[PDB]
Amino acid sequence: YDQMPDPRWVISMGSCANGGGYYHYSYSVVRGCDRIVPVDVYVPGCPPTSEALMYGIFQLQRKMRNTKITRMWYRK
């Protein structure tokens, strides 16, 4: 993740990456990937259907489309 250049985004797909899922009470499992990396959109399901993941990618692109880059600098 650190080796991924800016701009960069993280999609958390699935209960395990969201909050550890079915293995939440295990001795070897991180209870959600957002203890490790920041997360931009969370997709529910185990597994999320192919379309549910597409819906989360459509959320992230809708977030890009409302992201203010050059008008942000113009406010500072």
Residue 36: closest CA among 10, 7, 4: 10
5 versus 72: smaller Cβ distance to other proteins: 72
Residue type, 21: G
Question: Considering the rule CB under 8 A, would residue 27 count as an interface residue with other proteins?
Answer: yes
Residues counted in the chain: 76
How many residues contact other proteins, by CB under 8 A? 49
- Minimum distance from CB of 5 to other proteins (Å)? 13
- Whether 33 has a binding-site annotation, put simply, is no
**Residue 25 has what DSSP assignment?**
T
Distance from chain centroid for Cα 46: 15
In whole angstroms, give the CA distance from residue 45 to residue 57: 15
List interacting residues with other proteins (CB under 8 A): 7, 15, 18-32, 34-52, 54-56, 58-59, 62-63, 66-67, 72-73, 75-76
Binding site feature residues for [4Fe-4S] cluster:
16, 46
Binding site feature residues:
16, 46
